[PDB]
Amino acid sequence: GDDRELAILATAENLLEDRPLADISVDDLAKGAGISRPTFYFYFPSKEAVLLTLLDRVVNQADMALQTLAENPADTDRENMWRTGINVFFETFGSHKAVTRAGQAARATSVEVAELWSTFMQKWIAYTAAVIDAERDRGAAPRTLPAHELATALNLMNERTLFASFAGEQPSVPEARVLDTLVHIWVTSIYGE
Amino acid sequence: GDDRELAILATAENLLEDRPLADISVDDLAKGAGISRPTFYFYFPSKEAVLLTLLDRVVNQADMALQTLAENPADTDRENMWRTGINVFFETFGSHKAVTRAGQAARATSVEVAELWSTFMQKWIAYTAAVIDAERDRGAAPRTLPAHELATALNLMNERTLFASFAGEQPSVPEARVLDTLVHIWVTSIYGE
Ligand SMILES: CCCCNC(=O)N1CCC(C)CC1
Ligand SMILES: CCCCNC(=O)N1CCC(C)CC1
């Protein structure tokens, strides 16, 4: 069954907790999944292609949850709306730190990964700008910055800040504090004059 | 004269505009500086060590300018103070995009570079938190987030946002708009309730 593919994906994710991809081998991957090295190469052309697929799953999972969120409005409080949105990325990527970590590094080498970050970031920034615009129309938010430019910076702040937190980088916001920090900065940049 | 070292530094920076370090060679570096490959190795043990030195110069230049700024206060306007601070990093790194670009990528491989970003970021975040605290004491800023946590996120936003702008990443704030965007988000997160 294809589900050997499922087995390669789980072997990889597991191993990426312990060491970078560079220090992970196709032997290591095939072994974990309980297939031969040549049977591995039937399912994925490279180690790098396996990362890509994982990052794709994680990214689409985040996207899907944000689509679920947008199709029903949680009963009022503007701050809570934002907190609930940003939580989608905190939880989704926070459940996949290993993948999140390797994906981000791979952006410097794998334009195929870079393109995948880029696509999904553009989409999410577009969604951010539409909510700010909608909020500006209702009269709740002042027309300050260009909405899309503001949305871009805010999304970039969240990419950088969440992943530094996840990787325990120095410096970083503690993970148990990161959510409140971003929301404060989001709400206050969106609604403030 | 050592100033062969100066010549290796300028050859490298020049070339890093055209191609990544990976595609740049010690031959290329020695040639540009007008020395032999073995004379090169007297001055720097690797290509990677040359990057490091450049990033060090650029980082200290930014730091020094921020020290100049702090030792005399520009006549009032809280927003302008911040704009003037952030401008230091916009101008300094914006004059060294090639170096800025290669330094950032090298963080994923060269813990010696990672450590250099880390050190200087910690310092700048500390300075940010001290200005917010000072501002909170004068009574001008509300005691909202922990000052250091806020300073960290804001600095990370600026690292991510400025370098995406510089590299023409999609997505990004246009460079001619990036300054205003960050300041708005800075001022409004610092002074807003
Ligand atoms: C509707 C609110 C969207 C919030 N966006 C958000 O949290 N992002 C921060 C995390 C990165 C990975 C994607 C963009
Ligand atoms: C006193 C204000 C400091 C502003 N900090 C700032 O603009 N930074 C953003 C750019 C990165 C490279 C370092 C931190």
UniProtKB/Swiss-Prot annotation, chains A, B:
Residues of the site described as Inhibitor-binding: 155, 158
Any Gene Ontology CC annotation: cytosol
Annotated HTH tetR-type domain residues: 2-62
Gene Ontology terms: biological process: negative regulation of DNA-templated transcription; regulation of DNA-templated transcription; response to antibiotic
Keyword Cytoplasm: no
Protein keywords: DNA-binding, Repressor, Transcription, Transcription regulation
Residues making up the signal peptide according to the UniProt record: none
Any one GO MF annotation of this record: DNA-binding transcription factor activity
Disruption outcome: Cells lacking this gene leads to ETH hypersentivity.
SUPFAM superfamilies: Homeodomain-like, Tetracyclin repressor-like, C-terminal domain
UniProt xrefs under InterPro entries: EthR_C (IPR049397), Homeodomain-like_sf (IPR009057), HTH-type_TetR-like_transc_reg (IPR050109), HTH_TetR (IPR001647), Tet_transcr_reg_TetR-rel_C_sf (IPR036271)
Keyword DNA-binding in annotation: yes
Highest taxon listed in the record's lineage: Bacteria
Start-end of DNA-binding region: 25-44
Record text on activity regulation: Inhibited by tert-butyl 4-(3-thiophen-2-yl-1,2,4-oxadiazol-5-yl) piperidine-1-carboxylate (RF1) and 1-(thiophen-2-ylacetyl)-4-(3-thiophen-2-yl-1,2,4-oxadiazol-5-yl)piperidine (RF3).
Pfam families from the UniProt entry: EthR_C, TetR_N
Record's subunit section: Homodimer.
Annotated function: Involved in the repression of the monooxygenase EthA which is responsible of the formation of the active metabolite of ethionamide (ETH).
Note: Binding of inhibitors to EthR induces a conformational change in this repressor, which is then unable to bind its DNA operator, consequently allowing for increased transcription of EthA and bioactivation of ethionamide (ETH).
Record protein name field: HTH-type transcriptional regulator EthR
Gene expressing this chain: ethR
